[PDB]
């Protein structure tokens, strides 16, 4: 019964209690806000090819 003197908690159960959650990448905040601010650029810039300024305030000609 030498196995009953070994630590009963497995090496697996250490690696799933220490590494419980997949950690958040540093770059996943950049490349997720950048793709969402690229829609703020598109709609709201005045130099974009798809501005909403002629759709929401139609021009007086």
């Amino acid at each position: 019964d030498r196995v009953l003197s070994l630590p009963a908690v497995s090496k697996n159960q250490v690696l799933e209690n220490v590494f419980h959650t997949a950690p958040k990448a540093p770059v996943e905040h950049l490349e997720k806000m950048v793709s969402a601010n690229s829609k703020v650029y598109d709609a709201l810039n005045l130099q974009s090819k798809r501005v909403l300024i002629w759709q929401v305030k139609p021009a007086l000609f």
């Binding site: 419980h20 959650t21 958040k24 540093p26 806000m33 969402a36 829609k39 703020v40 709609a43 909403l52």
Partner: protein
């Protein structure tokens, strides 16, 4: 109206200042999964409030019901306050 909702996603606390592993390992494993879910939620809210190419098709859900109320058989500009004021003239005169 999207600007009034974007202004309150402007005032969201920077959760990415707590992504380091000295916050990962000091924190309860369930309060860290809630924190990583509250950060995934902000990207859900922010990527849909900046979907401004969807506002032009939401405006077409307001137009056809408004335009049918203007196709009134009485007048385009009729309302209740005028049509009640013209019932007072109709009722409180002789027959």
């Amino acid at each position: 109206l999207s600007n009034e909702r974007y202004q309150l996603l402007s005032q969201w606390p920077d959760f990415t200042t707590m992504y380091g592993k000295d916050f990962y390992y000091r924190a309860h494993p369930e309060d860290l999964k809630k924190f990583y879910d509250a950060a995934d939620e902000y990207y859900k809210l922010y990527e849909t409030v900046t979907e401004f190419d969807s506002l032009s098709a939401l405006a077409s859900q307001v137009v056809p019901n408004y335009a049918a109320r203007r196709r009134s058989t009485v007048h385009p500009a009729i309302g209740s306050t005028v049509a009640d004021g013209a019932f007072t003239n109709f009722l409180l005169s002789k027959q």
